[PDB]
Amino acid sequence: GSHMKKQKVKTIFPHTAGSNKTLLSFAQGDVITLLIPEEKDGWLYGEHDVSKARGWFPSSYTKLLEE
């Protein structure tokens, strides 16, 4: 931006853990901030803006905010 310096991604569908603890849950159109300079085998690690929860999640469930 111009008065900010934090990378983000924006979600495009909801996500759930089902049978796990280390998985970050969310909805469509949510905002998540990155915690690693690269992904791990398709999994990203991030912190949600609304929930402030952390965990692994599928990078493909999100897109670069500024397309």
Binding site: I36, W43, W56, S59, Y61
Partner: peptide, 17 residues
């Protein structure tokens, strides 16, 4: 410290128009 990754690859969104 970042927690360990799972033993399987990450899933994908639905394939739609």
């Amino acid at each position: 410290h970042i927690p360990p990754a799972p033993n399987w690859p990450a899933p994908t969104p639905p394939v739609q128009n």
